[PDB]
Amino acid sequence: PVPSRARVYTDVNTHRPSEYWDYESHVVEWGNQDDYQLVRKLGRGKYSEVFEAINITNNEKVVVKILKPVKKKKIKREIKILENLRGGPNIITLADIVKDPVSRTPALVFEHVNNTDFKQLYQTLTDYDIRFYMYEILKALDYCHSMGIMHRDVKPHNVMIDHEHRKLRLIDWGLAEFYHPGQEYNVRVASRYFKGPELLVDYQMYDYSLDMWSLGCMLASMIFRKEPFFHGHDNYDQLVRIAKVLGTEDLYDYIDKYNIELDPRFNDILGRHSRKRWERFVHSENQHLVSPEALDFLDKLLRYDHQSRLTAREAMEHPYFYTV
Ligand SMILES: NCc1ccc(-c2ccccc2)c(Cl)c1
Ligand SMILES: NCc1ccc(-c2ccccc2)c(Cl)c1
């Protein structure tokens, strides 16, 4: 394959000492698990259990994410990234890191967010509310990309919103990684519906722009009330769903530009598809959320070529946000 490099924040890690990005060498220090009283279970993740808790020293609510220690290197990575990003705009705050002695289990302690339900959001949110929260996510992405970090798991479940206080936090940094120009990354990242074409075609030299594709998927589902927008049933079918909207001609131009070898599993499923106009997804139920500025902004995010997508900073300057 042909090499690629990010158009922005290309060398931010190159120009910092190893301590910043070498998470494997990072020394993790535990807090006191006895400072936290678990209140209730909030839910269960792939390799984690999330609880609402009280910090008994200051009577503040916190969230405790109990990790199933499957890979130590991955836990060190999440911790180092959370420490590096601590205090950034709309980044979840890691308040503490604790361990249970007997069970020998690590846990991350976060600021608590009174999360407004997803199904309770996409019907009451206005055109303004969509622009407002999209801009809040862009603040978090431009910040983490400026800090040389790709989130790699942008999706609705990883965006906590306290609607009453118009407060947004980008969470679950467990798949995040440091961007190093020329580095070949694992493509088995992000959640199916939000995976960029780069991942689906096994193009490893990707960058922060992967997050901009995921953001585009979120925007499309919100303005069109079609959740998820690209409904793949497996990773191969996910590319077919994208190709049914973006068309197969541009898919091959992308493969040719980067000299990508297309997996034989695509042979019988990809077919031939024209490019669809964004206006065809407009209906009576969603027309109050769609505007020419909304469709122009979406068109500039949902592009096969990872290099041709708007950066988070370029996205923030789009006319779609003139009212926020
Ligand atoms: N003081 C009550 C209590 C008990 C166990 C844990 C715990 C569980 C798993 C991993 C780390 C800590 C915590 Cl956070 C609090
Ligand atoms: N935690 C679920 C959820 C629901 C809706 C949105 C949203 C809101 C406005 C614009 C785009 C997405 C987000 Cl960011 C998260």
Side-chain angles (χ1 to χ4, degrees), residues 115 118 121 125 129-130 133-134 137 156 159 161 218 222:
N115 188 227
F118 187 12
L121 276 160
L125 296 164
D129 285 330
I130 301 176
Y133 288 123
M134 282 290 297
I137 298 167
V159 178
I161 296 177
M218 286 180 60
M222 289 299 310

Side-chain angles (χ1 to χ4, degrees), residues 79-124:
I79 291 171
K80 185 64 182 177
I81 285 172
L82 285 164
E83 292 192 351
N84 284 346
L85 298 177
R86 191 193 267 134
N90 301 335
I91 304 295
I92 198 71
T93 294
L94 178 65
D96 212 351
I97 303 148
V98 292
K99 187 142 223 170
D100 185 28
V102 172
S103 72
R104 259 194 63 188
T105 307
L108 304 183
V109 183
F110 296 99
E111 88 186 87
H112 180 269
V113 182
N114 269 308
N115 188 227
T116 311
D117 179 73
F118 187 12
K119 331 288 168 288
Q120 199 189 47
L121 276 160
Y122 55 72
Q123 212 206 291
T124 190

Side-chain angles (χ1 to χ4, degrees), residues 140-247:
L141 296 176
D142 185 49
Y143 178 76
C144 71
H145 296 169
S146 81
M147 292 286 280
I149 292 154
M150 320 178 252
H151 182 281
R152 306 201 303 179
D153 198 21
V154 174
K155 63 180 176 174
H157 282 183
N158 286 346
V159 178
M160 301 286 95
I161 296 177
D162 178 6
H163 194 47
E164 184 194 1
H165 300 290
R166 299 194 75 81
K167 176 166 72 183
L168 181 146
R169 298 294 183 249
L170 180 58
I171 68 158
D172 198 4
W173 295 79
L175 284 173
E177 186 58 276
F178 293 88
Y179 178 70
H180 296 283
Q183 199 162 108
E184 285 179 325
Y185 293 96
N186 193 323
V187 299
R188 298 200 82 165
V189 299
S191 302
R192 192 192 306 142
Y193 313 139
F194 306 92
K195 292 175 181 273
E198 55 268 58
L199 305 189
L200 305 172
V201 303
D202 306 302
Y203 183 77
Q204 297 186 88
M205 205 174 296
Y206 62 79
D207 58 71
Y208 315 113
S209 59
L210 166 62
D211 292 336
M212 302 303 297
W213 175 273
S214 306
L215 185 62
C217 296
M218 286 180 60
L219 179 63
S221 59
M222 289 299 310
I223 68 170
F224 299 133
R225 290 195 182 183
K226 185 187 186 172
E227 178 226 298
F229 191 72
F230 299 118
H231 200 159
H233 289 351
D234 73 20
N235 292 338
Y236 302 97
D237 183 58
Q238 186 65 27
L239 186 61
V240 187
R241 306 307 107 176
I242 293 164
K244 282 178 177 276
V245 181
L246 275 76

